[PDB]
Design a protein around this ligand. Structure first.
Ligand SMILES: Cc1cc2nc3c(=O)[nH]c(=O)nc-3n(C[C@H](O)[C@H](O)[C@H](O)COP(=O)(O)OP(=O)(O)OC[C@H]3O[C@@H](n4cnc5c(N)ncnc54)[C@H](O)[C@@H]3O)c2cc1C
Ligand SMILES: Nc1nc2c(c(=O)[nH]1)N[C@H]1C(S)=C(S)[C@@H](COP(=O)(O)OP(=O)(O)OC[C@H]3O[C@@H](n4cnc5c(=O)[nH]c(N)nc54)[C@H](O)[C@@H]3O)O[C@H]1N2
Ligand SMILES: Nc1nc2c(c(=O)[nH]1)N[C@H]1C(S)=C(S)[C@@H](COP(=O)(O)OP(=O)(O)OC[C@H]3O[C@@H](n4cnc5c(=O)[nH]c(N)nc54)[C@H](O)[C@@H]3O)O[C@H]1N2
Ligand code: SF4
Ligand code: SF4
Ligand code: SF4
Ligand code: SF4
Ligand code: SF4
Ligand code: SF4
Ligand SMILES: [Cl-]
Ligand SMILES: [Cl-]
Ligand SMILES: [Cl-]
Ligand code: NA
Ligand SMILES: [S]
Ligand SMILES: [W+6]
Ligand SMILES: [Zn+2]
Ligand SMILES: [Zn+2]
Lengths: 351, 566, 78, 429, 125, 253
């Protein structure tokens, strides 16, 4: 049995495992859900008015619950479609040839370069990227210019609700957005396929029917929004972030590096990440990460046919440089993937 | 047109005729004071004349009987008989086809038989089969024990609403009386459960079987119905159930009858007078039930006599049917009726030396012989549950001969004699008491004696049975074989003045009539009741109310009895 | 009632699933009186095909997701 | 005028909540009926008049008396006459067909021989644990569609009784239930289900035998894989069956026409019987035509059997010996009457090749494949549209079909009454 | 030619014109064979192209159609005279022919489907 | 001994029910009395003489009476039904119900036998040199008991439902057997020298021996330790366990 938003409150939001993706807000046909402080909220006054005058519209809907990455699929159709969307890919290592991107990117700048090409080529009208404010609090945006893409390059380890810029399907259609590409964590890419896998999803007025390309980032875990402030960090002097064996490495303007140990980061890990077993995103057209490739290069897993097409276009046009990933790097990727699977199974049974 | 039966010995208990040599005159299907010289004459010298046989409890038509016929082609094959210039083909033994149902009743000397249970939703099927049963007059009792509208009215203590639904339900099903089977149990069976007793609340309705029985008895009397409530008690076929059966009768002592008759008729008490706590110590407690009956004039019962051999159990008691089918590893037919009742059909074979069957066989006989009033215990086999009605002559001969009973007991287990008191019973019913148990009592409990059935008084229907037996020269105790044959093959069976059978052979196949009760209630009672029933039809029933009630096309020859609130 | 509209394609087979699950239809069924031939149902079947009443349709996702033939669809033309 | 509470005359769901708009004796609109029902009720081009095939091999128009007399002569003069169809006419007409079969000493067979006949054979072995459709509507939290595609064959079954309806004990409807489909291909019924168990063709008897073993706690005798299905999946199915509050299996042609035939249904009847030791469980055959159930009911209460051979003036029942296709494959039929059924289009080719060589009488309102082989063609008024009659729903509930429009065509009852009278004169009865 | 297991049964379009068997709508709904993606690709033909389905009991020519729910080796012919030209006529000791699960072969063909009257004419003498 | 030779003098396509062709009924009768024996050609009540030329040699008891049918009779049913003694030799094929309900004697069919051959056999011997159709040694619809005694030997193949509801006696098939031999077996012994599939569904007691290959086993049998029957190693199983059965199923290894 599914109980729409009420089920999400009892089993995900109030349970403390919400990944703040925003998918529930982006699927609701009655615009009941909206993201506030990166937390899903419902307009209960509007729901009560609709139910009192027109009936129980959530009863046989449950679209928000079937779209949540923290709700297990239960129906045959959704499970069948999700399995068909799971794809293995060829592992390679790539790096951008455009200097403005390499100056701000996290590794090889493949995400920023791919999105740049998709916009310059007219393949997409907009892209969902993660920008940030002065305090490094992520700000998801639907970008259509290079300036906005460069301002989003780099990696932030707190939540950036990829679906918040897509909660108004009417406005997107009014603004001429017919094709959109998105970048997100495996939880966010899995959420995209969860909605697309819903029976008759293509007949709903949702942004999931106009998303043409999906990049899934490698992700070990995300931290709560309190991490920066509580950890007492001179944010004004911060230039970038990067999590590795030594812990969260905060690069500073002086060239110095404040290293926070993984042992201190345990209290900041999001509860929803502790039960996540998806490291490489088998649901993305192309998955991009750091592990397995040399520093300054991005590990790319080209999975779908559209991913292979776009990847070759970037190569044919000299927009990226490619190299092979050694056996050592291939095993390291598979080890991190099994590591997350084992820790997720342990934390799930624990509950 | 005119028929005269002369020089016969008449046994008419309804009018107190105890074997008098009197002539029976019939004109235009009705008994008259005298007929003309041109009347056809039957010289019944040395023969016994009785009213046409009446069977107040038998499973002769409907879904349950047809389920038995479909699931039992082996039974069908066992009683096949080709067509003749007068008759259509026959089939079955425990579940005969509609044609043989009427032919075999006529051949046995019966002119009227009533269907023991009509489900309201599927009453059209019952009436469709009635239209194909030849000769006999027919009627049926409508099921109300596990009805949602009944239980709702019982919970609200609204007897006026209940009476309106019973009157409406009888018209919808074209029924004659109120049948109650395992009250509450059918509803509990909706989720695979059963009521454990009289005070076990029914899930989802907050009423108890006892509350359902008393409320329906009160509604039955408010509607001045000809028959009392017909009851198949809770805990049927379970050791120690004799206490529930007696307790149910005690709780009904406080209900006043609207007419001069019983306030309750408890059917097939053979299956509800069980002693012990498990099958190991199982024993007959007919003595306890008979003792209570001998001091309680508000109750009538029928034997539900067991007959050794093939049988097909069929009842609205879904729980006991499944339980018995599992116990025997037998075929199991189930038919839950939405919002109304349960149904189960299980083939059975009663065998001698099976201690449970031997004790059950004795219970029916013990109930009849230990109850002083012959009118209080009707002869039945709960056809075909206890055994096919064609076996009534065996039961008659057992009731009239302690010698036949002794010979039959010798063929059973030794444990039977230790768990029954039948071997020590020497009572033998005479010809007059057999007429009571085979027609007069059946018509009396149903109130049909006031509508021309079960008697040979002037004004009654010309339904007569002439048996080739001289009551003055035959000792029914010693010559029990002769008694059995005489009752098995009556010399003549007369239906409405027309000879329909002679010595077990059909001679004419006229069409019989369907008896049903049209009970009227004040408009406010119906209006209040229809508020609830219309809601049930709008949300839960799977059929439209406009297509639910049985139409006149299924009752082509009715005899509508008028009843209702005073 | 809304910026969008819910429509039924010719793939509809008149199964009545939409007419049974619609929140508007279910609310009307709970009234003092209910006649499926006259009630202002948001979606109902006639001649084996479903039709939407735009004056009362919420444009929710109930009939879209449950339609076994995939005949129900939302339309919005800027 | 609007006629309310009309009854569909197409599938065993026998929907009785239709409202029909009639203008100038023509049906204009049909409310709530699915495509299948609406198309039948709205009508097609019908046979305008009776016809008899001449020496030239052409169907020439003839009077109703000429066609009926030719039909009576054909049937009375036969030693092995077969009367097939009946499933699409009323019980009153079926009763007349049974009486006609008796007078001519013929075989009367329903469409059941090629449909749920094996189900009846299984019921004759184990008994049928079923319930009226309203019971499952109000209580079923588990519904399994086994070898049936209701999305295409019983379109309103799900919306009227099996899934989306709210019940007295299921306040939400579909969300209060779990439905499963067992089939060899992913049908539209399977796509919308909570679970789809794709099995190998003709493997149902093994699958049900293994599930029953697991329900009874005898999993040790079940191998790791049964007909390509893992044991762990079968254990999960058994778990769903024993953990539900009220379960119902709705099965169809996938069990009756596949390998093992009736053996598939009797093992399922044993599974339902065993399941009742754990929870409440029932089963219902998804009966085809609106009145296939009715013929089996009438024939059984009048003869003792669902189908019958009355050659020796006494009922004889034995599918595999006296069924339509058994007799046609053996080439032992010398005359046939096809009424309310299309043998030419729905029997195997080998049977038609033999049926095409015998005198054939067709009683049907529309021209179809059987008309190509018919020597006598008699148009009839349609039950549930042009005349009243009784029909039985798939769950045994009988309802009275309603007359919606007036017609000058003869009803099946009238055509058969006239054949019976003429046959009696020929026979000397 | 490809080995297949034929299943016959109901389709909404087949039932919608079941009482109008001489029409083009009935022919379009019943003279057809639904096949899965692997079999259609291996056949090397497009939807609408004619195929010959052959069994030990007969052969029929009907246009091909795609059904993504059909696994490899499973073909479906809607019930009707075209399907009944290849089904198993054996009654299996209970009066039931083999309508579902008939072994056969499917192959492209230059031949054309036969209308209902022509198909019935083949069974006449 | 008394020998009655019946020679087919026709070839009607309509099934003829001739349950009256038994050494029990023919014993002591004249050629004319045997010719006037009732047979049913469909709904046509007629005489045996219309279908056979009758030649008699002697007059003895049923036990010493031998009937010889010279030719195939693939449309004559119930031949030898209920016979208690004597011999019936059929020089060709025979229709359904051959030896049905027979209690004694012997019937030898030189050709093939149609469905229900030896159904409800209580005793005696039935030999079929050719093949058998469905329900060989089975019972009637809805009956819990079919074959109760006697021996049926088929030298060729048999089709589906061999020995359905068997309660005793023995069935030997030298060829292959169709689907589901030994359904609900309750005391019978079935031997199949060839191949078969899904044997002993719902068996309660009895023995099924298959010397050929069993394509598929019903998942209701408990495998036991292999056993040697006359030196031949057999795979042994007990079941149907789900039906509470304890019958034995032997499949040659
Ligand atoms: C929380 C998090 C954890 C990660 N953990 C790992 C890991 O364990 N191992 C590993 O190999 N790689 C990990 N990555 C991926 C890695 O840090 C790089 O983002 C990736 O290699 C792409 O680099 P790039 O130079 O090719 O792309 P770039 O050109 O640098 O662009 C990166 C893209 O990621 C987007 N982005 C940044 N932060 C977020 C966020 N919080 N949510 C959604 N989108 C965002 C940006 O908008 C930008 O479009 C993680 C990323 C994130 C966001
Ligand atoms: N549109 C339409 N509807 C109709 C009819 C019609 O002709 N057309 N006719 C009506 C009649 S008369 C009837 S009886 C009903 C029948 O309705 P159904 O019982 O649904 O009959 P089918 O659709 O022929 O087949 C049922 C399903 O069985 C599956 N199947 C095939 N082989 C196997 C197997 O080995 N195992 C299993 N488990 N499944 C298998 C098929 O894939 C199919 O989906 O439809 C009725 N409704
Ligand atoms: N290949 C294959 N073949 C099959 C099947 C399969 O699944 N696959 N299924 C089989 C099954 S289960 C069945 S039941 C059959 C289909 O069963 P059929 O009865 O052959 O189905 P229809 O073709 O609809 O034939 C019904 C006929 O009755 C007529 N009719 C309708 N109403 C009336 C009326 O009131 N009176 C009279 N006299 N006639 C009326 C119609 O015009 C129509 O011609 O097909 C069988 N054949
Ligand atoms: S169940 Fe549907 S309408 Fe209700 S809140 Fe969820 S997505 Fe919105
Ligand atoms: S979809 Fe995302 S935002 Fe909504 S409840 Fe689920 S995890 Fe939270
Ligand atoms: S660990 Fe999983 S849930 Fe947490 S941010 Fe990464 S992909 Fe999302
Ligand atoms: S729109 Fe869909 S659910 Fe509604 S009647 Fe049509 S096919 Fe059925
Ligand atoms: S969109 Fe919602 S309100 Fe409108 S017809 Fe569909 S279910 Fe009814
Ligand atoms: S489901 Fe069947 S009975 Fe109901 S409208 Fe459709 S075709 Fe008619
Ligand atoms: Cl009267
Ligand atoms: Cl529309
Ligand atoms: Cl011998
Ligand atoms: Na922007
Ligand atoms: S059917
Ligand atoms: W059918
Ligand atoms: Zn009773
Ligand atoms: Zn009773």
């Amino acid at each position: 049995m599914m109980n729409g938003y009420d089920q999400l409150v009892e089993e995900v939001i109030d349970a403390g495992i919400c990944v703040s993706c925003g998918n529930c807000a982006a699927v609701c046909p009655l615009q009941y859900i909206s993201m506030e402080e990166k937390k899903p909220v419902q307009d209960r006054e509007k729901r009560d008015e609709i139910e009192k005058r027109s009936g129980l519209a959530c009863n046989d809907c449950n679209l928000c619950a079937m779209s949540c990455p923290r709700i297990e699929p239960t129906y045959f159709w959704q499970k069948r479609e999700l399995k068909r969307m799971e794809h293995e890919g060829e592992v390679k290592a790539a790096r951008t040839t455009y200097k403005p991107i390499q100056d701000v990117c996290q590794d090889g700048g493949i995400v920023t370069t791919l999105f740049k090409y998709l916009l310059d080529s007219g393949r997409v009208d907009g892209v969902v990227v993660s920008q940030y404010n002065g305090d490094y609090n992520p700000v998801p945006v639907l970008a259509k210019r290079e300036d906005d893409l460069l301002r989003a390059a780099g990696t932030r380890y707190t939540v950036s609700p990829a679906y918040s810029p897509l909660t108004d399907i009417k406005q997107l259609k009014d603004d001429g957005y017919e094709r959109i590409a998105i970048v997100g964590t495996p939880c966010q890419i899995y959420a995209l396929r969860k909605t697309q896998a819903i029976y008759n999803s293509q007949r709903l007025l949702i942004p999931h029917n106009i998303i043409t390309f999906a990049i899934g980032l490698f992700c070990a875990e995300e931290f709560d929004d309190r991490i920066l402030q509580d950890l007492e960090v001179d944010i004004a002097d911060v230039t970038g972030f990067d999590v590795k064996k030594e812990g969260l490495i905060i690069s500073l303007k002086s060239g110095e590096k404040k290293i926070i140990p993984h042992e201190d980061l345990e209290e900041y890990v999001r509860e929803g990440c502790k039960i996540c077993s998806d490291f490489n995103s088998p649901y993305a057209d192309i998955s991009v990460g750091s592990v397995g490739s040399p520093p300054g290069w991005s590990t790319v897993i080209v999975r779908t046919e559209t991913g292979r097409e776009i990847y070759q276009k970037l190569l044919e046009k000299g927009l990226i440089e490619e190299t092979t990933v050694d056996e050592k790097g291939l095993k390291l990727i598979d080890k991190m993937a099994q590591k997350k699977i084992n820790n997720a199974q342990t934390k799930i049974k624990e509950r | 047109s005119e028929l005269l039966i002369k020089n016969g010995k008449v046994f008419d208990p309804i009018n107190g005729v105890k074997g008098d040599l009197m002539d029976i005159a019939i004109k235009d299907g009705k008994i008259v004071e005298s007929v003309s010289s041109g009347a056809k004459v039957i010289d019944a010298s040395g023969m016994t004349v009785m009213a046409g046989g009446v069977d107040a409890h038998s499973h002769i038509a409907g879904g349950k009987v047809n389920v038995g016929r479909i699931m039992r082609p082996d039974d069908g094959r066992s009683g096949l008989k080709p067509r003749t210039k007068i008759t259509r083909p026959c089939s079955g033994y425990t579940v005969p086809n509609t044609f043989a149902m009427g032919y075999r009743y006529a051949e046995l000397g019966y002119t009227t038989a009533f269907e023991a249970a009509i489900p309201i939703l599927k009453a059209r099927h019952t009436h469709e089969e009635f239209e194909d049963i030849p000769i006999i007059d027919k009627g049926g009792l409508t099921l109300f024990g596990s009805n949602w509208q009944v239980m709702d009215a019982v919970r609200e203590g609204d007897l006026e609403k209940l009476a309106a639904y019973v009157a409406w339900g009888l018209r919808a099903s074209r029924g004659y009386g109120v049948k109650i089977v395992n009250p509450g149990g059918g509803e509990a069976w909706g989720f695979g459960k059963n009521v454990r007793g009289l005070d076990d609340p029914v899930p989802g309705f907050d009423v108890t079987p006892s509350e359902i029985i008393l409320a329906l008895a009160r509604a039955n009397e408010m509607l001045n119905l000809p028959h009392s409530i017909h009851l198949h008690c809770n805990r049927l076929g379970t050791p120690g159930n004799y206490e529930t059966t007696i307790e149910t009768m005690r709780r009904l002592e406080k209900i006043k009858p609207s007419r001069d008759r019983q306030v309750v008729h408890v059917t097939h008490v053979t299956f509800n007078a069980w002693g012990g706590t498990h099958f190991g110590n199982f024993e007959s407690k007919a003595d306890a039930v008979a003792e209570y009956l001998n001091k309680s004039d508000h109750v009538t019962i029928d034997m539900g006599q067991l007959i050794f051999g093939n049988a097909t159990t069929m009842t609205a008691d879904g729980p006991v049917q499944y339980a018995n089918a599992r116990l025997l590893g037998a075929k199991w037919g189930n038919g839950d009726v939405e919002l109304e009742d349960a149904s189960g059909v299980v083939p059975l074979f009663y065998m001698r030396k099976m201690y449970v069957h031997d004790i059950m066989w004795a219970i029916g006989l013990e109930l009849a012989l230990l109850t002083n009033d012959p009118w209080q215990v009707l002869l039945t086999t709960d056809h075909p549950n206890g055994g096919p009605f064609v076996n009534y002559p065996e039961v008659i001969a057992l009731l009239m001969s302690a010698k036949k009973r002794e010979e039959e007991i010798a063929k059973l287990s030794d444990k039977m004699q230790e768990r029954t008191c039948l071997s020590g019973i020497d009572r033998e019913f005479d010809w007059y008491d057999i007429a009571i148990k085979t027609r007069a009592a059946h018509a009396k409990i149903l109130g049909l004696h006031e509508y021309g059935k079960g008697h040979l008084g002037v004004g009654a229907d010309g339904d007569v049975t002439i048996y080739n037996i001289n009551t003055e020269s035959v000792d029914p105790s010693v010559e029990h074989a002769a008694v059995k044959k005489a009752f098995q093959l009556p010399a003549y069976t007369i239906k409405g003045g027309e000879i329909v059978a002679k010595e077990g052979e059909i001679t004419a196949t006229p069409t019989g009539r369907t008896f049903w009760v049209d009970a009227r209630v004040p408009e406010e009672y119906t209006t209040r009741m229809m508020k609830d029933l219309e809601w049930k039809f709008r949300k839960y029933y799977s059929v439209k109310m406009a297509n639910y009630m049985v139409q006149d096309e299924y009752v082509q020859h009715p005899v509508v009895l008028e009843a209702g609130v005073n | 009632m809304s910026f969008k509209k819910v429509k039924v394609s010719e793939e509809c087979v008149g199964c009545g699933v939409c007419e049974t699950v619609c929140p508007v239809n279910n609310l009307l069924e709970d009234g003092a009186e209910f006649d499926p031939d006259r009630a202002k149902l948001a979606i109902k079947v006639t001649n084996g095909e479903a039709a939407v009443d735009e004056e009362v349709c919420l444009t929710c996702g109930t009939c879209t997701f449950n339609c076994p033939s995939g005949a129900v669809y939302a339309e919005y033309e800027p | 005028v609007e006629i309310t509470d009309a009854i569909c005359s197409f599938c065993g769901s026998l929907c009785d909540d239709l409202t029909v708009k009639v203008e100038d004796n023509r049906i204009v609109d049909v409310r709530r009926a699915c495509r299948l029902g609406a198309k039948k009720i709205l009508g097609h081009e019908r046979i305008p008049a009776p016809m008899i095939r001449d020496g030239s091999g052409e169907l020439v128009e003839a009077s109703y008396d000429e066609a009926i007399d030719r039909a009576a002569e054909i049937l009375a003069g036969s030693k092995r006459p077969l009367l097939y169809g009946w499933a699409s006419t009323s019980c009153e007409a079926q009763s007349k067909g049974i009486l006609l079969a008796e007078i001519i000493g013929g075989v009367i067979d329903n469409t059941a021989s090629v449909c749920h006949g094996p189900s009846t054979l299984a019921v004759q072995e184990k008994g049928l644990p079923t319930a009226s459709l309203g019971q499952m509507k109000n209580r079923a939290d588990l519904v399994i569609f086994w070898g049936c595609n209701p999305v295409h064959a019983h379109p309103r079954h799900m919306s009227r009784y099996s899934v989306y309806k709210k019940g007295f004990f299921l306040d939400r409807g579909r969300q209060n239930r779990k439905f499963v489909t067992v089939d060899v291909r992913m049908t539209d019924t399977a796509a919308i289900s909570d679970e789809f168990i794709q099995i190998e063709q003709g493997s149902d008897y093994l699958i049900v035998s293994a599930i029953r073993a697991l329900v009874n706690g005898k999993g040790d005798v079940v191998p790791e894989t049964v007909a390509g299905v893992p044991k762990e999946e079968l254990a999960r199915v058994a778990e769903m069956m024993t953990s539900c509050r009220f379960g119902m299996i709705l099965y169809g042609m996938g069990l009756t026409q596949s390998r093992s035939k009736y053996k598939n249904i009797d093992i399922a009847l044993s599974l339902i019987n065993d399941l009742n030791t754990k929870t409440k469980f029932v089963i219902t055959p998804m009966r085809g035509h609106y009145n296939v159930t009715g013929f089996g009911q009438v024939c059984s209460w009048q003869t003792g059997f669902p189908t019958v051979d009355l050659a020796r003036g006494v009922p004889y029942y034995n599918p595999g010996e006296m069924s339509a296709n058994d007799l046609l494959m053996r080439d032992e039929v010398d005359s046939a009457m096809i009424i309310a059924g299309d043998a030419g289009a729905h029997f195997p080719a080998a049977s038609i090749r033999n049926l095409a060589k015998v005198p054939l009488v067709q009683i049907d309102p529309y021209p179809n494949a059987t008309t190509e082989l018919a020597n006598v063609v008699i148009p009839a008024a349609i039950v549930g549209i042009e005349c009243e009659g009784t029909a039985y729903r798939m769950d045994g509930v009988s309802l009275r079909m309603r007359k919606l429009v007036e017609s000058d065509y003869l009803s099946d009852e009238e055509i058969l009454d006239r054949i019976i009278e003429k046959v009696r004169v020929i026979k000397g009865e | 030619k490809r080995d297949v297991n034929i299943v016959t049964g109901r389709t909404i379009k087949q039932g919608a014109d079941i009482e109008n068997k001489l029409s083009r709508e009935y022919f379009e709904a019943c003279a057809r064979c639904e096949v899965g993606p692997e079999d259609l690709r291996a056949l090397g033909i497009s939807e609408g192209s004619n195929v010959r389905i052959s069994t030990d009991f007969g052969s029929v020519v009907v246009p091909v159609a795609l059904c993504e729910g059909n696994p490899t080796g499973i073909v479906f012919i809607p019930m009707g005279p075209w399907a009944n030209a290849v089904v198993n006529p054996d009654t299996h000791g209970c009066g039931m022919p083999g309508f579902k699960g008939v072994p056969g072969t499917i192959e492209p063909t230059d031949d054309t489907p036969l209308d209902l009257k022509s198909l019935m004419k083949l069974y006449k003498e | 001994m008394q020998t009655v030779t019946l020679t087919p003098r026709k070839s009607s396509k309509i099934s003829v029910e001739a349950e009256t062709i038994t050494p029990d009924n023919f014993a002591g009768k004249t050629v004319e009395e045997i010719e006037k024996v009732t047979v049913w050609e469909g709904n046509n009540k007629t005489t045996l003489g219309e279908f056979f030329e009758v030649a008699l040699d002697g007059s003895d008891t049923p036990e010493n009476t031998k009937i010889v049918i010279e030719g195939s009779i693939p449309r004559v049913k119930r031949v030898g039904e209920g016979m208690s003694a004597g011999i019936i030799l059929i020089n060709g094929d025979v229709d359904m119900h051959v030896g049905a309900k027979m209690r004694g004697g012997r019937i030898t069919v030189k050709g093939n036998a149609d469905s229900w051959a030896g159904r409800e056999m209580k005793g005696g011997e039935l030999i079929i040199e050719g093949n058998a159709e469905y329900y060989l040694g089975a019972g009637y619809r809805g009956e819990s008991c079919g074959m109760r005694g006697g021996r049926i030997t088929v030298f060729g193949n048999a089709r589906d439902y061999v020995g359905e509801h068997m309660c005793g006696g023995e069935i030997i098939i030298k060829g292959n057997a169709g689907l589901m031999p030994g359904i609900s077996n309750n005391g019978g012994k079935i031997i199949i020298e060839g191949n078969t599939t899904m044997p002993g569904g719902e068996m309660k007691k009895g023995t099924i021996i298959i010397n050929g290959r069993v394509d598929e086993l019903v998942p209701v049998y408990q495998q036991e330790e292999d056993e040697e029957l006359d030196g031949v190693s057999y795979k042994k199983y007990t079941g149907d366990v789900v039906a509470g059965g304890k019958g034995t199923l032997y499949i040659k290894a």
